[PDB]
Amino acid sequence: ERTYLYRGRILNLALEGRYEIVEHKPAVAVIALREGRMLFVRQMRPAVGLAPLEIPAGLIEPGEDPLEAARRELAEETGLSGDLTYLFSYFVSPGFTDEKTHVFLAENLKEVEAEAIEVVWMRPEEALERHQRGEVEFSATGLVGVLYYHAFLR
Amino acid sequence: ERTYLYRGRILNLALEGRYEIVEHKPAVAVIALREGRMLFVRQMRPAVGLAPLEIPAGLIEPGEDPLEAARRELAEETGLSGDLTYLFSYFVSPGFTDEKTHVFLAENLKEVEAEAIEVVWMRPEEALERHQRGEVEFSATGLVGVLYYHAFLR
Numbered sequence A, B: 001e002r003t004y005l006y007r008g009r010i011l012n013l014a015l016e017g018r019y020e021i022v023e024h025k026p027a028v029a030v031i032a033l034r035e036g037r038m039l040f041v042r043q044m045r046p047a048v049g050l051a052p053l054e055i056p057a058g059l060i061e062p063g064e065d066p067l068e069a070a071r072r073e074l075a076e077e078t079g080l081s082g083d084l085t086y087l088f089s090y091f092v093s094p095g096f097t098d099e100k101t102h103v104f105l106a107e108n109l110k111e112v113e114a115e116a117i118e119v120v121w122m123r124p125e126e127a128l129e130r131h132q133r134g135e136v137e138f139s140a141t142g143l144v145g146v147l148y149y150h151a152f153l154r
Ligand SMILES: Nc1ncnc2c1ncn2[C@@H]1O[C@H](COP(=O)(O)OP(=O)(O)OC[C@H]2O[C@H](O)[C@H](O)[C@@H]2O)[C@@H](O)[C@H]1O
Pocket: A018, A019, A020, A021, A092, A093, A094, A095, A096, A097, B009, B010, B027, B028, B047, B057, B058, B059, B060, B073, B099, B139, B141
């Protein structure tokens, strides 16, 4: 039995007995490789005070399913379209939030549309090296993209 | 300039202009392989109403650094100790929270201590197959462990 403390724009804060629970819209993220570069994006994220390396990601809006949201945010954030394949999903931090991320692969990318969101094409090997040297932070989606590449796309 | 709406046990809810921000303690997670099985754990997570496949994880408590927290939660959740190596970190969902997870590898595991938290040794290949068939959900830490294994531990 959830009692609500806050109903907001992209989250609700609830108590469920002793548990603090943040309800959040589901998200999507897209892994895309071109000429050995992965498609990352960076934007200022006020929650962390910096711009981590992410892959294109967004929230699922009313009416959409994950595939449609993935197509939309790839086009909105990078101007690209591709052939999308569902990979897997994960709960970002299920000890306090229900946010679930659905991750897709994009292939055969084409420009459909010509630095709020900065597009950062970067070899995943270099992203991993920059992170190990302390030069860039990852979001979960960025790290999942780099690990998925090393596991399956070489 | 953050104004606080809620100060709680494992999170704070703040507004920073138009942004809803959840402050949260940093976390650790430990990837451990033994005889081709990865060390997963499962527990009921009221935020999601189910028990996703995770790897041993916990919050960093006052006084600790990530390595020490990782040692602690491995022992508390599974009764094991090992030789720990830092791998990488990630922000779980930097569009709304500052929670950061530090991920370690554990090797040479030994039992130091003899189903609140269920220990689930499982080959990562099988965890990935069960997830693809809809039989289990992943946390970010579980998915990162499975992807890291496939990338680097075969
Ligand atoms: N929603 C909550 N509200 C209030 N207290 C809680 C909650 N969840 C746990 N506790 C209390 O907080 C103590 C912390 O339990 P520890 O093992 O260090 O952490 P973890 O495994 O939960 O979270 C580790 C990560 O894994 C997941 O991705 C999480 O989202 C984190 O990112 C618990 O004993 C409870 O007393």
